[PDB]
Each structure stands twice: as C-alpha cells, then as structure tokens.
C-alpha cells in the first residue's frame, strides 16, 4: 500500500502541464516556482520526486490549475 500510494500519486502528473521555473526551496516539500505565465507561486512539491535534480534553476512542470510541482 506504500506501493499502491506511489501508483496512485501518478494521476496528478496527468498531461497537460505548465512548464515553470524553480526558484528556491522553502521547507522540506514546499518551494517557490514561476510559471511561464509571469507570476510566482508558493506550492507544495509532490512527494516522491528526485529531490535534488530540483534545485539549480531547473525546468519543472506544474499541474495546470493547482500549480503543484509534480
């Protein structure tokens, strides 16, 4: 069921996504991103993600209307 939950997360990564730009961590799962919509955001990061490919200034995907860094 830990495995189940990891299969169940997936849905959030449903296409289509909005490419944005990671800016900086905050806590151990929340970060500051910037859509290519112009705005910034303070969103939850999706658990189970290579936590440290995340930093440099890497491109990321946000979940259209919720903006979760998936």
């Amino acid at each position: 069921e830990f495995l189940h939950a990891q299969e169940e997360v997936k849905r959030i990564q449903s296409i289509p996504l909005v490419i944005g730009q990671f800016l900086e961590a905050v806590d151990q799962n929340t970060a500051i991103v910037g859509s290519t919509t112009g705005s910034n955001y303070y969103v939850r990061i999706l658990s189970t993600i290579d936590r440290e490919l995340l930093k440099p200034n890497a491109s990321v995907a946000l979940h259209k209307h919720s903006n979760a860094l998936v």
């Binding site: 939950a5 169940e8 959030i12 900086e24 905050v26 910034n40 303070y42 939850r44 999706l46 919720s66």
Partner: protein, 254 residues
Amino acid sequence: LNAKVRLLREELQLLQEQGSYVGEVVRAMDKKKVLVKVHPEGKFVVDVDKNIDINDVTPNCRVALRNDSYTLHKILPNKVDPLVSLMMVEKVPDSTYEMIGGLDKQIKEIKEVIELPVKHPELFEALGIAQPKGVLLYGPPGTGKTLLARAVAHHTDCTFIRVSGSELVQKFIGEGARMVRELFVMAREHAPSIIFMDEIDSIGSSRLEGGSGGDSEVQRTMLELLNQLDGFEATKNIKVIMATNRIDILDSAL
C-alpha cells in the same frame, strides 16, 4: 507505517488548492492590515493570518499569500535588500592589505582618516576636532587607488558602495532626479558605509570636456549634503572617497 501511507493516500487531495501568490510587504497598516505588492500585478491591502505577529511583518520582506482571500499565509525565508545585491552588480572585487603593497605610507594615512574616526570616535571628541569626511586619492590609472579603497573598507568592516550613476543601479535604488540623498537612504541603513567614486578621465581627456564636469556632480552634492544630512552628523559613519587621475582638474568648488 500506517501514518506514512495515510499521508500519501491523502496527499492527492492536498494538491488541489490553487497554490499561493508571492508578494512583498510594502508597509503595514494598523488594523492588522498589511499593504502587499503582488509580483506581476499591483498592490493589495490584506488581512493577516493570526499565527504571524504583525511585528514579524517588516517592509521589504517576502510573504506568501492565499490563492483566493489573499491573507498573509506564511512569511517566506528570503529577505531582499538591494545594497546587498546592487554591490554585486558592480563586482568591485574586495581585497586585503596583503594585496596592496609598495604603498605603505599611503595605507597608514587612510587608517588615520577612516579607521580611527570609525573605531575610536572618542579620540576626536577628546582632542576637540570635527571628524573628517572627504578623502581624495589621485595618481596615474592603475596605481591601486581603487584597490586600496576596496581594502580599507574590508578591514574597517563597512558596506562598500561603488557609485557610478549607470541606470542599472537606478532600478535597485529608485528615481534618477531625486537620486542623491536617495543613496544616503541605503548607506544609512547599513552604516557604517563608504560611498565610493571613480572620477572618469582614467581613460582620456574627453572626460574633461563636452559636458564640463560629469562625475564632479556625485560629490559637489554628496559632500555638500554630507555636512548637513539628517541627524547623522552626531555619529559620523558615512565617509566618501573619490579618485581621479589628475588633481589639477577638480572643480574649484571641490
């Protein structure tokens, strides 16, 4: 294990709120309302969440902000100050007394003019003389006039402000016309401070014509303004350094 898996099954519902806008606090009102500037948009006066004091809100710090009601959800970690940043866009690379050598006599003199009045102001109040501000260096270009200036500020432990006027700094500082005292607004907050010039004509005699005194404005004002600037004369932490190549050219008013 139960707790962990419970979290991950519940998470999919946590990831549905529309997120949060990051604005910056401009300044607070009294009614537990705060004036906040949302990055890509205008400004909004907003309520604050009860868990964050109105005393932790401070003009210029970054704040989260609910994606609908716009309350101050949580204070973000990253405060943003330009003088801290601007100085890194001039890249004037600070050095040490070990790097400037073969000057010596000069090093020892600026220590009597900048180091002593910052560290031991009691020596000039006891002697009975007013603290000195203007300090003019001069010699052919590339004799270490800036190299020494960078250092002196590094051992004294003051903020070092290269002034140049370039419009790039005016994004960090404010508006051109009034921008004079506007610099002293940033120096004073990080005092003690050494505002630093770089009188051009370190490249030619075309900098001594066609305009007729282009960088001798950054000091005929700074310095005229630095005898009677606010109530900072009591504790004088803001020196000013300019450096030419030719000491004959300075405008007689200097």
